[PDB]
Each structure stands twice: as structure tokens, then as C-alpha cells.
Amino acid sequence: GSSGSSGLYVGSLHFNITEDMLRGIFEPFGKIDNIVLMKDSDTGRSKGYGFITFSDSECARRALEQLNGFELAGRPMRVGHVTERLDGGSGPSSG
């Protein structure tokens, strides 16, 4: 539906970087469904961000934690959820 799509956003990357780099890094993190790079028109220079969709929401979360602050080219990159919405299974029972 609306709140479920397992998508992750990546920003603050090096123009040099490519889809092969994102897939290779997000590969061992979770089954990648598809990868799409976002760029400009007036400049046509990869600002340094892209969109990636996983198969399982759990896998996306893990990759986000490992990626979040993962220096790729000397500096830490930016990783966040596409839906920017929290989620989880409630149940304070036995707590």
C-alpha cells in the first residue's frame, strides 16, 4: 500500500561512484530489487544521491544502520528511509 514499500535513500556520495558500487555494497546487506540514480538537468552532474529498493523491510533497516555513517571516499555518507516513517511490532509484554 502506502506505508510499507521497502525503499532506502542515499545521499552525500562521490560523483565518481556508480550503480555497481551501490549494488555491491547494498548487495551483502539485502536483496536489491532495483537501483536508480538521480541527477540534474541544467548541470547533469550526479549531485551524489540515488534511490534503492530492497525485498524485505528488515534487510533495508540493517543496511541503513551499517551504511549510515559509512565512509566510502574518506567522508561519511548519508543514509535514510525513503518513506521517512517509523515502524515495528509493539508488545511491552514481559517487560
- CA distances in angstroms from 72 to 29, 48, 59, 81, listed in the order given: 15, 12, 20, 19
The continuous run of DSSP H or E covering 36 comes out as strand 32-38
Which experimental approach was used here? NMR
CA-based radius of gyration for the chain: 15
**Superfamily designation of domain 3-95:** RRM (RNA recognition motif) domain (3.30.70.330)
Provide the CB-side half-sphere exposure for 69 (13 A, CA): 1
Q: What are phi and psi of 78, to 5 degrees?
A: -110, 130
With CA atoms as reference, report the closest residue to 82 among 44, 49, 39: 49
Residue ranges per structural domain of the chain: 3-95
